[PDB]
């Protein structure tokens, strides 16, 4: 991975690093993890509306959305701008709608 | 003196400098098992060294014989030791067979350094002076005792250490006279070991609610026997709960909200996890005010519930299922009624934690659960060792129950605590009905020869539950003189008595300077004088073991002893 | 008449709660908790490698604070108690009382590596050295806010009889200078319900924060939610205040053109090009105790005509002429701030000369994107003006290529004259 | 506070469908309320150079600025501006400028090189002459602007700041402030005529302009004309009061007050205010616009009660000499300051200086005769120090000989001999 991003950290100016280093820094107090824009109660609620509106298709969530939600809700529980109980609630609302669409697809 | 309260950061930074590497494990923590405060101290101290990535090993130890065994076999790469909850009152340099010349390195300059540090986290007193002054390897932590209390002993220690005939006679017996008065003080606990480590976390800037809960648990365990110490520390815990609690009030309950309130925590047995009736019936304090072993005491309990206006059929409901109106009215019912019985002191404010939707636990109720895990969580040398192995094995049940991920193990503990307190009570009534407490002028004697599930009382902690129950019971009676109590119980398999010496205490509401456990000297001095077979190896040196036939000769010389 | 209140950068009121921030900036934040008639103060850092957090109990009830990379300074506005607490604790803390008259208050405090500075509601200005030795007493228009960064000090003054003004200083271990003394400050005071009034009772001036940018150019964020940065101040006859965020517009833009009342910005620092701030949500303007992560807002020159954005959206899409006009202006101001830093102070990271080279590259690409509109509307005269301001001789090749693609041969010949003139 | 839109020498509607937006040396601009539209007329005082036109206004432009190259217009509430060059070989152009809720464009100015917009929140916006933006800056709220030859002069006002001005020049590297938000010594206004005008223009600035040699001027509510002297060296700058205009009207009336003459300034050419004179129940010009008149500059060294007691007004000639010396002293320092900096604008200028030293000396020798007539040696000897040049020392000896006062000559010869040898 790109070494040039880590030797150039300055406290509280944002940067990108590979997720396994962000979790290793966040295990100490030495980082905080900025949730992607799609982990916002606005963007999750637009995806839930898309899902209900288009029975024939899955919404354009990123390939890792369940995996990354589960990692960050456990390891970075304090870093969300929205209250994490409403994010867990909407991740479940999306999980359940897509499970119906899968059973229709089979 | 050795590390005062102002300078715990220097002792901690010295651990990081000496014992942090990614190469190896270098740090060992020896923790006394059978001590909740040493458990909560060591839990905090492991969460700290986890966050700093310090590779470490924790070894639970039962007593001094196992301390020598485990120290004797430490790998020579191990260069820091923490002794959590023991060793302040023994000469560790002599006991572990240290000679500092076999440990010194880089002696240049008015200088030394050593290949190992031994940091002693201990709340017991009187401190051994050859640890606190007389060694450079042993490194005690202090609450303030040494500078505040030991200045005459410091001077006496050095003038006697320097002086290796009238001018000599006139002085050597003054300084030995100061040390001889300093020893010939009984044992006491003067602080919590967890509040010491929380004041270290406050120096480093590591405080949070998880470390604060472990500070509250460790300190609450003192309240039963060292009430005078809990009351010093309690004001300081209230301030930290306010400091760390977030801004929101009239907050909605959610699965993620931890709340750590200060609120009414009645001095009752496992209230939130038992009935309202069992809460009173099995409380040490209630039993002591109502004389609740005999059936007129049980009448006084029903007559109280009837007068409070709670049906027995409601009082006996499990507290979750007991009705919503009683549980909010209860503060008013007690503030009206308890005064009639003198039970007014049951009203108390304490710390109550609730996590998400899983229902509140108080610090009082949580230490009752954690102690019940230490006590019962699972050829005489094998018969001792395969028992002491069990008490080391139980330490990890209490440890894992401090984790929020493991509430099912806390719920094991809360059931075991209710099995124990019932057995303590059914034994404590047998003692008081059968008149087994004999008055021996200098002290009170009690000796359990036979009985139902007597094989519990071979754990030192379970003997101390029954001790603290018989002490509360006596300490509230206004006619009895306060006297030291000796409580003995047989093991029919080892063929020894476990003997515990207990300090009395003042009635729970009266408000004096402390009283000290001098059985710790009386047992050693009688042991040194006799040819009897005993064990004097426990860390709470008020507790000993003695072979069955030697006990009556031992007690026969204990009554003669001027040391009590 | 007007009422002087104690100020500290980015500090918040108690409101209905028992706790508030005394201050926040690029170093950290400080909070105070009301704790049964005494207070407990926690000082926290954003860099946990350098600084270790601490707390103490305060018997005196301090309500002023200033936090920098060397120490924390506390003041009690009503009694004149001040305390300085160095961060290494190799140096001792020190405490002093300053002489307040009846109805006088400390309005603000600051610290510098060599000085501790105090300002009061009667406009006395008391300097103590870093060890508490009195060095001066000036008198000024009353100082309603102070800030420092290293040896630079920036103060805002206000009185009924003087109006708003500022001073900027560089006190130093030697070669002390005052860059500006009591010059007028072009910043709006509030239009003097409890959502605002519980804040304006606490901070009548409405200065949400006062800070230096990471490159040491003064910034102020006022009641009008506009971030103003002082340009070219090292040479006073050429100074100007630049409005580099209209943060009300920049919020309306990202919420998709809803007139948005439930969102407020709270500024912490301007690292180059980007305001670190809390975006607060709810009916109170200021953040709460579990301090949310500082968000980042990229600075934008106020050239966004809201009515044009409304008609072209009816996620917001910005007309590519308006977007090129902003990137050209934003790049022209940032390249002047870097250029003057690199010439007067020198670089602090080697990157700064490579940033400046990349920033000129975004300026010329923005001008060429405007030159295309001037060619599309066949305004040969406007096009020649856009080509003349263009920097790189290699970028001016693109101007002649665009003018041929547009078939405007007058511009071709005129641009060829620019090549030779600038070569000479 | 009202923050009304401003343009130089513009007038209110005042229960009438016609008003002027602007007047200058160049010309004037007026608007007619053409039913629910407007119609704008862009006249000139010189039809030999440029030809008048009319255009229809859809927007309701209430701002204007006229220079000889073109006319700039703006709508104070919608934020639209429009530039219209006088030679149609250049394009007209239009821009809309951002406004916050309640913000208004308070004034605009234009030069051949630069176009400027002010506002009631103090954002000062700049463009080149084709509507490319150059800069946004924030200042104290603008209440007036004027410009020439890439200089700008701006007047600012707020409750939180007081009345102040700024004076810029756009140098080739950067824009340099000669003065930034220095306080402005103009007096603000304190029924029908006043109240109509002050509801239209509450700052009471009637016009704001540069002199023919590029030194700032302002004409205020007090009817005084101020001119900023020495501004090219900030540490020596002075606002000179160079008319108390009510005093020339009282003088030209033959020593009477009047409610029925008022003066409207168009511009200052050297020693003379080009202006319009109006007779009215009201104080501002009417539709059939007077032919631009001239007022010669008069320093305020005349005492009203003395002139009527002495007495067309016949001035007591020492109070004439007192002005002639003082007025020549200021014009001398204003022309010299431009000649050594901006060369010659019009070529007559270095000849005018030599004629002006001669007027200054003539007045000093007239005061010197009055001081000799008092037998006041010490006063007469001070005037003898203040002569510009060598020949005027001859009249100082001749008058002191004639007045039988050679105690002056014995000192004055020492001044002369020092002055010519060294």
Curated annotation (Swiss-Prot), chain A:
Q: Which UniProt keywords apply?
A: DNA replication, Nucleus
For this UniProt entry, what's an example GO CC term?
A: nuclear replication fork
Protein name per Swiss-Prot or TrEMBL: DNA replication complex GINS protein PSF2
The family note in this entry says: Belongs to the GINS2/PSF2 family.
**Record bears the keyword Secreted:** no
The record's Gene Ontology biological-process terms are: DNA-templated DNA replication; double-strand break repair via break-induced replication
* Organismal lineage: Eukaryota, Fungi, Dikarya, Ascomycota, Saccharomycotina
Q: Which pairs of positions does the record mark as disulfide bonds?
A: none
Q: Which organism is it from?
A: Saccharomyces cerevisiae (strain ATCC 204508 / S288c)
Subunit (UniProt): Component of the GINS complex which is a heterotetramer of SLD5, PSF1, PSF2 and PSF3. Interacts with PSF1 and SLD5.
Function of the protein = Functions as part of the GINS complex which plays an essential role in the initiation of DNA replication by binding to DNA replication origins and facilitating the assembly of the DNA replication machinery.
Q: Where in the cell is it found?
A: Nucleus
Curated annotation (Swiss-Prot), chain B:
The protein's name is Cell division control protein 45
Keywords of the record, alphabetical order, are: Cell cycle, DNA replication, Nucleus, Phosphoprotein
The compartments listed are: Nucleus
> Single GO molecular-function term?
single-stranded DNA binding
Could you name the Gene Ontology cellular component terms for this entry? CMG complex; DNA replication preinitiation complex; nuclear replication fork; nucleus
* The keyword DNA damage is annotated on this UniProt entry: no
The record's Pfam families line, in alphabetical order, gives: CDC45 (PF02724)
The entry assigns this protein to a family as follows: Belongs to the CDC45 family.
GO annotation (BP), single: double-strand break repair via break-induced replication
Also noted in the record is: Present with 1730 molecules/cell in log phase SD medium.
Q: Which InterPro entries match?
A: CDC45
Work out whether the entry's keyword set contains Transit peptide: no
Q: Subunit structure, briefly?
A: Assembles into a complex with MCM5/CDC46. Interacts with MCM10.
Functional summary from the UniProt entry: Required for initiation of chromosomal DNA replication. Acts at the origin of replication. Also has a role in minichromosome maintenance.
Q: What is its main location?
A: nucleus
Curated annotation (Swiss-Prot), chain C:
Return the WD repeat spans: 222-262
Top-level taxonomic group:
Eukaryota
Coiled-coil residues are none
- According to its UniProt record, where is this protein located? Nucleus
The entry's function note states: Accessory factor for DNA replication. It plays a role in accurately duplicating the genome in vivo.
**Miscellaneous notes for this chain?**
Present with 3280 molecules/cell in log phase SD medium.
Please report the name of this protein according to its UniProt entry: DNA polymerase alpha-binding protein
Gene encoding the protein: CTF4
